[PDB]
Amino acid sequence: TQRIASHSHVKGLGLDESGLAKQAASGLVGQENAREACGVIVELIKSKKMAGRAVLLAGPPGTGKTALALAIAQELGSKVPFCPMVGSEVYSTEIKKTEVLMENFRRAIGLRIKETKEVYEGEVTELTPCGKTISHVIIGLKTAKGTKQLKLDPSIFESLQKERVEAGDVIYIEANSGAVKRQGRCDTYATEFDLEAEEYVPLPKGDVHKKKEIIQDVTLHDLDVANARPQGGQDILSMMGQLMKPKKTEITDKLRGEINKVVNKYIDQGIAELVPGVLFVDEVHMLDIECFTYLHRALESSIAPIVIFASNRGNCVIRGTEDITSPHGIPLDLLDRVMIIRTMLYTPQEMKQIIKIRAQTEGINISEEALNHLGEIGTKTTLRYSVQLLTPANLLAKINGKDSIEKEHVEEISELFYDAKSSAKILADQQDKY
Amino acid sequence: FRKVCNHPELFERQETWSPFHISLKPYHISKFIYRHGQIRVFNHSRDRW
Amino acid sequence: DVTRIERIGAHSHIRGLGLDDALEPRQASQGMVGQLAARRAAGVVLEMIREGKIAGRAVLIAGQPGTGKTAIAMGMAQALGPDTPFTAIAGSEIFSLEMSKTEALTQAFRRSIGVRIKEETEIIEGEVVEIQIDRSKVGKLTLKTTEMETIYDLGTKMIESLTKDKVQAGDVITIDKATGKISKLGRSFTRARDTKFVQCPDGELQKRKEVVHTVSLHEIDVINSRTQGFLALFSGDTGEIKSEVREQINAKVAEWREEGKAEIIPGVLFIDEVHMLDIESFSFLNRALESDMAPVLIMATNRGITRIRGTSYQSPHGIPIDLLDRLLIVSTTPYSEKDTKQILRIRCEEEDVEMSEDAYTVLTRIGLETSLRYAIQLITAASLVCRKRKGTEVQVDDIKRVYSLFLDESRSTQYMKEYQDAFLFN
Ligand SMILES: Nc1ncnc2c1ncn2[C@@H]1O[C@H](COP(=O)(O)OP(=O)(O)OP(=O)(O)O)[C@@H](O)[C@H]1O
């Protein structure tokens, strides 16, 4: 089964049909003013009218600034691109800082391309090539469900010969793409020799021919990459692709102009449709002043995704300015370009509900006395520390032979693992021995 | 004693030196990873676009 | 005796993390002693790792220098063992010249989450009794175990393999039937006449062996990166690996996990001396610890309230509050006299040296006067002066000799204050 991650308990914004926030829903609690506002951002992103418009989630550590941003991704669902990045990823050693911003701005715009999947597979019963020489190759296929003959393009037959295919092999043909694979020799030929260097596979029990609608997701960044450098052009089967190492590169401005011009042509022909997604920048304050001054252009641009930023700093110095202080660690002239959402500190009565939601997600039964006690730890410390005690306390409860948390299991962990406050007190009282 | 003093090839001949030659194990790739696990293969229908 | 590459080192005496089923540490076992609080805590973390079900989790082992914070982190690795990834780095090891500092942590996080699969193979193994060939081609082979014999008609791709690899009657061989590769194990003892010699296999010739195999999640990224990937795995040419490839591979492994064709095995990252990371690198740990593929990580530090690198800000452990809020902090404690003497006995077992009981007493005094680690270094040098003396055992005057040959940091610093103008800079 799936692993329980830090945000695996949140399933959406959980707003009611009027747009108001419920007190507790979809794994979130409290936070009404902030999460009601994120509803308006989901309505904005789903409306597709806008480019480059941006939002800043601001407030103390442990208050929901990652939780709400991932809750937006759950409200959008897998059909809409959501690119997460950390502001600290901008410091590449192969490309300039502004390029790492531009690549991530291009990961957040998606094409949505529809095509029919068309698979033929089976034992090959015959091959017959038919300028007069090879117009096509007829190929015969067999499975336990029946037979077909197919008329192959000479480029597909060149691929059959690439795979060293012969009659009596079991083949997968992907007719919409020209992919070809040998699965193995058909086991009706498994006695052609007693010991030979081929692997034999049973005659496929599946249909000779299979259809699906499939929907392909591709970002503008995948186009910007795959068309910029000369391709490897070499499907392993080569050796020049061993010599020149692949590396990241400062992809030109002009090429993106042509990708935009080709994508415009295809969305007009209805072969593709567009989903402007979100770029989510964790730790935005970790961007350099040079990067912030690139966003003074990137957020204006008529193609750009919606951008969501997170920060938890006070009136600190702006990274790389030497001495300029500005709120949230973001330059005032960028801060004047974002809608700001404030994020509140939880009351203990909210924290107890988060602890319960985490416990029932994490798979832990907890007695009401111990859940009250983790609520008391929520008064002493922070939400993250109290949440982090659950699995540790469950393991001591399990070793002590019970399938539920009780007081002495959580009181043991509270003595055994310190928080930042208590350990900082222990450092200050021995400051001359570290 | 005279042999070495006369020419050291009478005692030991200078050997034909060559670098030390070595091979590791071949790096074993699983059949499952080889069938389902390269983006060059499992994504080829997308890569066409 | 001969010496292999691994020799007696600063943690060689630790052969586990000695615990009862109750996750309570007995006073001394599996090669380590004391630290009852920190080792009970490390037992709970070792069970969170072995359970695997909770993702993106952290423990910081903190306390005065020499207090076993690397010791419990190294013992925990021995107790965890093979069949779960464990990877260690020092904090200054991520500062690559050739790769982004942030990407170097992304590799360290994904060396340490394993994918595990099982595959079935038709393997033929036996003594080759006889082999025959003709001029297309045809030929015949015979194989033997201790319990059966066969003859076989060979196909052409086998004929070329057997003849290329000079397979001769009386070899004991393994044939990878799916692939035509031959491995030769040696020759049969009955044909050892006219090197390596071995007995025939037991059971039948053709076994449908099942192989379980594991690949680190990062090791799938490097296989995907280049026309041949695996060279860049060993040679270090892996650099700035394109993040859209990871966006695909993480999602591909996330369906293998649930179609049941693979299972993911959460391991450990041990990022030792964590206070070396920049605030830029902490900003990555702040967020990389919040996704399903994240391992548990152990971090170790010995710093007070200190300036965090890349800023003028001072905070506990040399880590921003930003990241300390993610994690649980386990405190080591300074050793008592009893525990100090008991560590010195165990180091004397691991180095294989005898010493007098009053020698252990004066060495324990030296240990308490010099924060243990210097006394551990005197053990070996005392035994070498004892060997120079042709002694059976280390005596008090061997230790008092060696204590005057090699200075601890405090006497070295005090002598450096006598000649204070003769050394350069102050
Ligand atoms: N409203 C909420 N309801 C339930 N859980 C929440 C809620 N808001 C936050 N969390 C909890 O907050 C914890 C940390 O995520 P959070 O969004 O608070 O990070 P953050 O501190 O705001 O992010 P950052 O470190 O980037 O500033 C998670 O364990 C999550 O379960």
Ligand SMILES: Nc1ncnc2c1ncn2[C@@H]1O[C@H](COP(=O)(O)OP(=O)(O)O)[C@@H](O)[C@H]1O
């Ligand atoms: N509990 C212990 N049991 C046995 N040996 C220990 C123990 N704690 C420390 N040691 C020994 O003393 C050394 C000092 O502890 P260590 O973990 O290395 O401190 P630090 O990481 O702060 O430098 C260890 O490297 C090991 O040789």
